[PDB]
Amino acid sequence: DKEGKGLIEATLDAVRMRLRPILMTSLAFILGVMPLVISTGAGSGAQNAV
Amino acid sequence: GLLVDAAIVVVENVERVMAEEGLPPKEATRKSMGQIQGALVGIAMVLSAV
Amino acid sequence: FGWFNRMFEKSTHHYTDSVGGILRSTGRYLVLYLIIVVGM
Protein backbone atom coordinates (compact mmCIF):
# COMPACT_ATOMS: atom_id res chain seq x y z
CA ASP A 1 0.00 0.00 0.00
CA LYS A 2 2.03 2.96 1.36
CA GLU A 3 5.27 1.28 0.22
CA GLY A 4 6.26 -0.71 -2.90
CA LYS A 5 3.94 -3.74 -3.11
CA GLY A 6 4.72 -7.47 -3.25
CA LEU A 7 2.44 -10.47 -2.63
CA ILE A 8 5.36 -12.80 -1.86
CA GLU A 9 7.99 -10.24 -2.84
CA ALA A 10 7.51 -7.55 -0.16
CA THR A 11 6.55 -9.79 2.78
CA LEU A 12 9.90 -11.60 2.49
CA ASP A 13 11.77 -8.28 2.31
CA ALA A 14 10.05 -7.25 5.55
CA VAL A 15 10.82 -10.58 7.29
CA ARG A 16 14.53 -9.93 6.62
CA MET A 17 15.01 -6.58 8.39
CA ARG A 18 13.79 -7.19 11.99
CA LEU A 19 13.72 -10.99 12.66
CA ARG A 20 16.06 -10.21 15.58
CA PRO A 21 13.10 -9.26 17.91
CA ILE A 22 10.62 -12.06 17.09
CA LEU A 23 13.45 -14.49 17.95
CA MET A 24 15.47 -12.72 20.69
CA THR A 25 12.44 -11.31 22.56
CA SER A 26 10.44 -14.50 22.07
CA LEU A 27 13.58 -15.81 23.82
CA ALA A 28 14.17 -13.00 26.37
CA PHE A 29 10.90 -14.54 27.50
CA ILE A 30 11.00 -18.35 28.06
CA LEU A 31 14.14 -18.13 30.25
CA GLY A 32 12.59 -15.00 31.80
CA VAL A 33 9.70 -17.32 32.69
CA MET A 34 12.11 -20.18 33.54
CA PRO A 35 12.67 -19.07 37.18
CA LEU A 36 9.01 -20.04 37.78
CA VAL A 37 8.33 -23.15 35.63
CA ILE A 38 10.54 -25.03 38.10
CA SER A 39 13.65 -23.69 39.95
CA THR A 40 11.27 -23.56 42.95
CA GLY A 41 8.58 -26.03 44.07
CA ALA A 42 8.50 -25.38 47.83
CA GLY A 43 7.12 -21.90 48.63
CA SER A 44 5.94 -21.16 45.10
CA GLY A 45 3.90 -24.17 43.94
CA ALA A 46 1.80 -21.51 42.20
CA GLN A 47 4.76 -20.29 40.11
CA ASN A 48 4.72 -23.79 38.56
CA ALA A 49 1.14 -23.59 37.23
CA VAL A 50 1.79 -20.03 36.02
CA GLY B 1 7.06 -10.12 30.36
CA LEU B 2 5.41 -7.53 28.08
CA LEU B 3 7.05 -4.49 29.74
CA VAL B 4 10.49 -5.92 28.87
CA ASP B 5 9.46 -6.76 25.30
CA ALA B 6 7.85 -3.58 23.85
CA ALA B 7 11.05 -1.72 24.82
CA ILE B 8 13.24 -3.74 22.41
CA VAL B 9 11.63 -2.79 19.06
CA VAL B 10 11.99 0.92 19.87
CA VAL B 11 15.70 0.07 20.39
CA GLU B 12 16.23 -2.59 17.68
CA ASN B 13 14.47 -0.81 14.80
CA VAL B 14 16.84 1.94 15.99
CA GLU B 15 19.74 -0.35 14.99
CA ARG B 16 18.42 -0.62 11.40
CA VAL B 17 18.55 3.13 10.67
CA MET B 18 22.27 3.30 11.59
CA ALA B 19 23.60 -0.24 10.93
CA GLU B 20 21.89 -0.48 7.52
CA GLU B 21 21.10 2.98 6.05
CA GLY B 22 24.36 4.33 7.58
CA LEU B 23 23.45 7.98 8.28
CA PRO B 24 23.84 9.64 11.79
CA PRO B 25 21.20 9.32 14.61
CA LYS B 26 18.47 11.65 16.01
CA GLU B 27 16.13 11.73 12.97
CA ALA B 28 17.30 8.15 12.27
CA THR B 29 14.50 6.27 14.09
CA ARG B 30 12.10 9.22 13.55
CA LYS B 31 10.41 7.22 10.76
CA SER B 32 10.57 3.71 12.25
CA MET B 33 8.07 4.24 15.04
CA GLY B 34 5.76 4.80 12.05
CA GLN B 35 6.29 1.18 10.99
CA ILE B 36 5.05 0.30 14.49
CA GLN B 37 2.60 3.22 14.96
CA GLY B 38 -0.46 0.93 14.82
CA ALA B 39 1.67 -1.64 16.63
CA LEU B 40 1.48 0.77 19.59
CA VAL B 41 -2.06 2.19 19.75
CA GLY B 42 -3.31 -1.20 18.23
CA ILE B 43 -1.23 -3.66 20.12
CA ALA B 44 -2.59 -2.45 23.48
CA MET B 45 -6.25 -2.16 22.37
CA VAL B 46 -6.10 -5.79 21.15
CA LEU B 47 -3.89 -6.90 24.06
CA SER B 48 -6.65 -5.43 26.25
CA ALA B 49 -9.12 -7.65 24.33
CA VAL B 50 -8.49 -10.77 26.42
CA PHE C 1 35.08 -10.34 14.58
CA GLY C 2 31.93 -12.42 13.95
CA TRP C 3 29.69 -14.92 15.75
CA PHE C 4 26.60 -13.22 14.32
CA ASN C 5 28.02 -15.01 11.27
CA ARG C 6 26.55 -18.24 12.68
CA MET C 7 22.87 -17.28 12.34
CA PHE C 8 22.97 -14.69 9.51
CA GLU C 9 23.06 -17.71 7.17
CA LYS C 10 20.42 -19.51 9.27
CA SER C 11 18.21 -16.45 8.73
CA THR C 12 18.69 -16.48 4.94
CA HIS C 13 19.37 -19.92 3.39
CA HIS C 14 17.64 -21.99 6.09
CA TYR C 15 14.89 -19.46 6.85
CA THR C 16 14.17 -16.69 4.27
CA ASP C 17 14.67 -19.00 1.25
CA SER C 18 13.07 -22.06 2.91
CA VAL C 19 10.11 -19.93 4.08
CA GLY C 20 9.58 -18.84 0.46
CA GLY C 21 9.44 -22.57 -0.27
CA ILE C 22 6.28 -23.28 1.75
CA LEU C 23 3.84 -20.70 0.34
CA ARG C 24 5.50 -22.00 -2.82
CA SER C 25 3.32 -25.04 -2.05
CA THR C 26 0.67 -23.74 0.42
CA GLY C 27 -1.50 -26.84 -0.27
CA ARG C 28 -1.33 -29.43 2.53
CA TYR C 29 -1.00 -26.75 5.26
CA LEU C 30 -4.76 -26.27 4.69
CA VAL C 31 -5.24 -29.52 6.65
CA LEU C 32 -2.01 -29.46 8.74
CA TYR C 33 -3.30 -26.42 10.67
CA LEU C 34 -6.87 -27.77 10.79
CA ILE C 35 -5.38 -30.85 12.48
CA ILE C 36 -3.73 -28.53 15.02
CA VAL C 37 -6.92 -26.51 15.68
CA VAL C 38 -9.02 -29.70 15.94
CA GLY C 39 -5.94 -31.37 17.47
CA MET C 40 -5.73 -28.97 20.42
Q: Can you give C2-33 as a three-state secondary structure string?
A: CCCHHHHCCCHHHHHHHHCCCCCCCCCHHHHC
Q: Tell me the angle at which helices B2-19 and B38-47 cross, rounded to the nearest 10 degrees.
A: 160
For residue A34, the one-letter residue type is M
Question: Which of B1, B4, B12 has its CB closest to that of A20?
Answer: B12
Distance in angstroms (rounded) separating the CA atoms of residues C5 and C3: 5
**Within a 10 A sphere around the Cβ of B1, how many other Cβ atoms?**
10
Kindly determine whether residue C11 and residue A16, on different chains, have CB atoms separated by under 8 Å. Answer: yes
∠ CA C16-C17-C18, nearest 5°, is 95
Distance in angstroms (rounded) separating the CA atoms of residues B28 and B18: 7
Task: Resolution in Å, one decimal, please.
Answer: 3.7
Kindly determine whether residue C19 and residue A8, on different chains, have CB atoms separated by under 8 Å. Answer: no
Residue numbers in C near A19 (CB within 8 A): 11, 15
3-state SS class at B49: coil
